[PDB]
With several copies, the nearest count.
Chain A
């Protein structure tokens, strides 16, 4: 689920917690691919 990753990641960031680099990388990959598939570029 991209949505659960996003939700999880943003919650980390806004909470002041240290944020997982792998979750950051993977979610960036998934958001981009979605944008690619929607002809955003």
Chain B
């Protein structure tokens, strides 16, 4: 029953157009309607906090960072790298998901979708150098559609010879890229379950969507959106499965794994955050809920886990380095009340969240002090 400290809040999103002159030119045009801006993913690198927006009608830029400027809605966004990549007339159409690797490359999953459905352009995977803010490589996703159903690239994971993984919730499959082959996989574990299609604050026929790669085991955990199961596939395989079914009491939302082997996941029904340690066996008595809030955790659309910096390995024993960033929009409302707070980036120290619970990693209490970190 923890609340997690808020890092950023919004009543609604707004952007740094330049002057209030240049904003009003966009409002009248319908380039920017505040009522249609919904965040898809967040991430963090140095001083930058990325926020991606689902490209509906009235969404000026998709790939953004939070700026120094502030509005009545909350922190204004600012397109990344510049406004050049905000344009789609198929030039980033809709930055669905983000990922940052060991080498300071930012991977972006552009779905190509408009209103999250009509595919105006083909999907692609971009790769920016965060040191320069310039683009290193762009690749079209052919892999991209079911080849039978015909059907939304809605999850991403990246492994400095790197390997990317892209879930397709609508088409129900797993694209596997090699740094230049692509390959679509399929499974019944990737398919949606009709039983858990209804997610009742107060229906979605989507499959594989909620991926999370363990840095310690190399299992890519996942589940269909309509499911109460937790499946996984080992990635050492990556030319053609594990996990329990119906293990959770409600549907899971986004997912993330710590370097230390703790899997976190959002619990849709309870409006809570749950965890599970990979060292334990996947069963009910090892699944615990670690935070919950009826106001603040309504749909956990994204989670990332970062390590405190700089990384000086000799001092690791003194520091609980890992912390979690949580995007909690209100997908249930996507009929909003824009006089209230709707979109939140929360955070917390990982170890503080699970300590003295079945989720914890074993504590060697071998120093007179331990420092817990977050932002």
Contact = CB atoms under 8 A, between A and B. Distances in A.
Nearest to A17: B47
Contacts of B367: 3, 6-7
A12 B373 CA distance: 12
Sorting the interface of chain B by its residue count into under 10, 10 to 19, 20 to 34 or 35 or more gives: 20 to 34
Contacts of B369: 10, 14
A20 to B, nearest CB: 11
A16 B368 contact: no
Interface stretch (B225-233, B294-302, B308-316): B308-316
Sorting the interface of chain A by its residue count into under 10, 10 to 19, 20 to 34 or 35 or more gives: 10 to 19
A3 B317 contact: yes
Contacts of A3: 314, 317, 367
A35 interface: yes
B312 A40 contact: yes
Contacts of A13: 309-310
Interface in A7-41: 7, 10-18, 34-35, 38-40
B338 interface: no
A16 B375 contact: no
A31 to B, nearest CB: 8
Nearest to A34: B314
Contacts of A35: 310, 312
B314 A14 contact: no
Interface of B: 44-47, 308-315, 317-318, 367-369, 373-375
Given A16-B309, A38-B313, 11 more contacts: A6-B367, A11-B368, A11-B375, A14-B368, A14-B369, A14-B374, A15-B44, A16-B47, A18-B47, A34-B312, A39-B310
